[PDB]
């Protein structure tokens, strides 16, 4: 309960008191790269600090080792540190070798020399940071006040409690303490929503902040639908609150329009054809099996029935027939039910600026992700790759400014190419039966084939994994086994291995709805790594992604088979 939802304001005031100055820079923000929510939140914070004239620095880091190396070089003149996208799960004081008594410069409690704020959404929390540390402070959103009721008592009372009742109680409370741990990890909220709450508390909300909040929230749709369904009504309310007025007389080159219009679960509808949108969709592919000939024939039959000529459905959206575009909603409503695709109809947010053209939030986040993925003796080889991944962050950052639209178009083209490549690899995976069904998990190792140099980036492998999980969820086979995806890099001679959680069908009822399936690959990987001298690298922010040498892959996986917890 360090900083509650209501308390978010006062912490800001502290940053205004210690850091703001016209002759020195004393605020540093460490933001997790390869993440969209953190990027949007950092953009909002940067604009806020720019308005109040507070000097700042933004440093994109990739892993925990980078953070540890950068913390030492950081001076004592920097009074404020902001860790965005990470830091909640691990013990920060032990990791950074922070001595509480060393940081007291304002003797009295202790005001302390430096303040570190943690803005993260990866549960479970670390009990040490929440309940036992004073230098480390976190922006909590209501997990502790409700979920961690007995944990606080156990932690504090075990700290203070340190003749047979003593032995009994200490054991049956360390049992509860270990019960808190040994649990998988999920995401339950979004950073951009919390920053928008801070904005509303201070009172600096506008259309740009709302657009950034929508962009941050939308990115969670593919992996965590429950959070999106929770946060959507508040976004709807805030959109209606900030509408300029009624009866807009004329469209002028300076109008901005944020509208709630009906959209569809289709891949880049307004920047490609209709046939392409239906072809390269995860949901349509899962529901119709387009990778073989039968799915393509079924799609052709559907398009024939709907009344759209096959020649017209392959034209660009701008140059598509006006009469067909006008009546698309009725045609969808009356025909989509026969083929099980009635779930593709939804409502979203569309933004328009003058005589330019309309863009939806989903297309924007796909363009940003595409810009993240592609843009612009083995240790150096990995270092160069990580440096390029850091470099792509500024390319994605620039695309959020209204002046740079050519970069957004480039991102759209890159997204189209990337999705085509993912589809091409997925059909090869599915046709040759490369997926092996073990008792505990399902294995997929890509050793040979073209364009394996695209899967050295974690985001592309997550794309392919999301394709495969979506394909498996709608399969009639009923199972919830986690999946393992491994990809080789010849230059480094290393496999990059990722563990992926199962997902329920998109349209399934809410009776099973709960806190989603927990990811248990981090604990298993740590358990196997500790016991054996395997040449593995666990250094990414996502604990489910590791880099293992080629020789160790086959034995290590065997150990995983007996590890359990999967």
């Amino acid at each position: 309960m360090y900083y509650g939802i209501s308390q978010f304001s006062e912490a800001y005031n502290k940053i205004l008191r210690n850091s703001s100055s016209h002759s020195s820079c004393q605020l540093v923000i460490f933001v997790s790269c390869l993440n969209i929510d953190a990027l949007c939140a950092t953009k909002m914070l940067s604009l806020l600090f720019k308005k109040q004239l507070v000097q700042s620095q933004i440093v994109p880091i990739f892993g925990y080792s980078e953070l540890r190396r950068h913390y030492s070089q950081l001076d004592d003149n920097i009074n404020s540190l902001l860790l965005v996208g990470f830091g909640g799960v691990i013990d920060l004081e032990a990791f950074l070798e922070i001595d509480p008594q060393e940081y007291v410069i304002d003797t009295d409690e202790q005001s302390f020399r430096r303040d570190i704020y943690v803005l993260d959404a990866h549960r479970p929390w670390n009990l040490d940071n929440i309940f036992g540390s004073q230098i480390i402070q976190c922006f909590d959103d209501g997990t502790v006040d409700d979920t961690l009721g007995e944990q606080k008592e156990a932690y504090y009372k075990l700290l203070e409690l340190d003749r047979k009742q003593r032995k009994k109680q200490i054991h049956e409370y360390e049992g509860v303490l270990e019960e808190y741990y040994s649990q998988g990890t999920t995401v339950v909220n979004s950073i951009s929503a919390q920053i928008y709450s801070l904005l509303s508390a201070i009172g600096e909300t506008n259309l740009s902040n709302l657009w950034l909040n929508i962009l941050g929230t939308t990115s969670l749709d593919i992996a965590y639908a429950q959070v999106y369904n929770r946060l959507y009504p508040l976004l709807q309310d805030e959109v209606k609150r900030l509408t300029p007025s009624s009866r807009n007389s004329v469209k002028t080159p300076d109008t901005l329009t944020l509208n709630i219009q009906p959209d569809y679960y289709l891949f880049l509808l307004r920047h490609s054809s209709l046939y392409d949108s239906f072809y390269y969709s995860n949901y349509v592919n899962a529901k119709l099996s387009l990778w073989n000939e039968n799915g393509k024939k079924r799609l052709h039959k559907m398009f024939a029935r709907m009344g759209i000529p096959l020649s017209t459905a392959q034209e660009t959206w701008l140059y598509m027939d006006h009469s067909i575009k006008r009546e698309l909603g009725i045609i969808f409503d009356k025909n989509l039910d026969r083929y099980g695709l009635q779930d593709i109809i939804r409502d979203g947010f569309v933004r328009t600026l003058g005589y330019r053209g309309s863009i939806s939030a989903s297309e924007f986040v796909e363009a940003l992700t595409a810009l993240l993925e592609v843009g612009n003796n083995s240790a150096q080889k990995l270092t160069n790759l990580r440096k390029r991944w850091v470099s792509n962050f500024w390319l994605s950052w620039d695309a959020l400014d209204d002046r740079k639209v050519e970069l957004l178009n480039r991102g759209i083209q890159l997204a189209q190419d990337l999705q085509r490549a993912i589809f091409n690899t997925g059909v090869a995976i599915l046709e040759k039966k490369l997926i092996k069904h073990l008792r505990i998990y399902r294995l997929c190792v890509l050793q040979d084939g073209p364009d394996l140099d695209l899967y050295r980036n974690p985001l592309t492998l997550l794309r392919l994994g999301n394709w495969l999980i979506e394909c498996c969820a709608e399969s009639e086979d009923k199972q919830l086994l986690p999946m393992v995806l491994a990809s080789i890099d010849e230059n480094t001679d290393t496999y990059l291995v990722a563990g992926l959680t199962p997902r329920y069908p998109r349209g399934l009822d809410t009776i099973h709805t709960k806190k989603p399936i927990l990811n248990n690959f981090s604990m298993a990987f740590q358990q196997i790594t500790a016991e054996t001298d395997a040449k593995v690298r666990i250094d990414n922010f996502e604990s489910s992604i590791i880099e293992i040498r080629r020789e160790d892959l086959s034995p290590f996986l065997e150990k995983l088979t007996l590890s359990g917890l999967l």
């Binding site: 140059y319 006006h322 005589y355 330019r356």
Partner: protein, 187 residues
């Protein structure tokens, strides 16, 4: 005539009020073209769709009839932004990004519609002369007359204006204006 005037007005407002960021691109292009004696204008269809979809829909279904109205709108705007008049009717050149249609897929379904296609030039003909302003006189009453023609497909009147014959009219070749026509072959 009560619809052509509004169409010309809509085109002139498109030319004079389109802006991206902080520059009227289509207003500046006209002035830059006039200086180097280029009497033409190039318009991208995406901008026209963005400005107003009704204007694009009007053009997309009746090109031969609508295009001359945009032609005269351009030269009305030019005489306003250039002169406080030897300016001929301007030319409209269009750019499109729609799907390309093969030559062998062109049939009776595509008549009177704007299309986009690609091919190989195999031959180019010589330049020929087409009349735009015709000075006309009658064989008997001998009075002056004029005719204005646009090349978007006319004949001399089959009557007399003020007995004269059936269709008595001759062309006064001096004081008449002509343009350049060429024929090309594709494959």
């Amino acid at each position: 005539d009560d619809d052509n005037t509004e169409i010309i007005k809509s085109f002139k407002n498109f030319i004079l009020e389109f802006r991206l960021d902080s520059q009227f691109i289509y207003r500046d292009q006209l002035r830059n073209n006039i200086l180097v004696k280029n009497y033409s204008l190039t318009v991208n269809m995406e901008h026209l769709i963005g400005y107003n979809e009704d204007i694009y829909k009007k053009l997309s279904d009746e090109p031969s009839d609508i295009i001359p109205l945009f032609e005269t709108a351009i030269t009305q705007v030019a005489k306003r932004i250039s002169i406080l008049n030897s300016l001929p009717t301007f030319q409209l050149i269009l750019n499109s990004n729609a799907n390309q249609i093969p030559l062998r897929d062109l049939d009776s379904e595509h008549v009177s519609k704007i299309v986009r296609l690609s091919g190989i030039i195999i031959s180019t003909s010589v330049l020929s002369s087409r009349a735009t302003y015709l000075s006309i006189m009658c064989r008997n009453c001998r009075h002056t007359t004029s005719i204005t023609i646009n090349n978007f497909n006319v004949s001399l009147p089959r009557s007399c204006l003020s007995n004269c014959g059936p269709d008595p009219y001759i062309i006064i070749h001096e004081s008449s204006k002509f343009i350049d026509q060429q024929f090309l072959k594709l494959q």
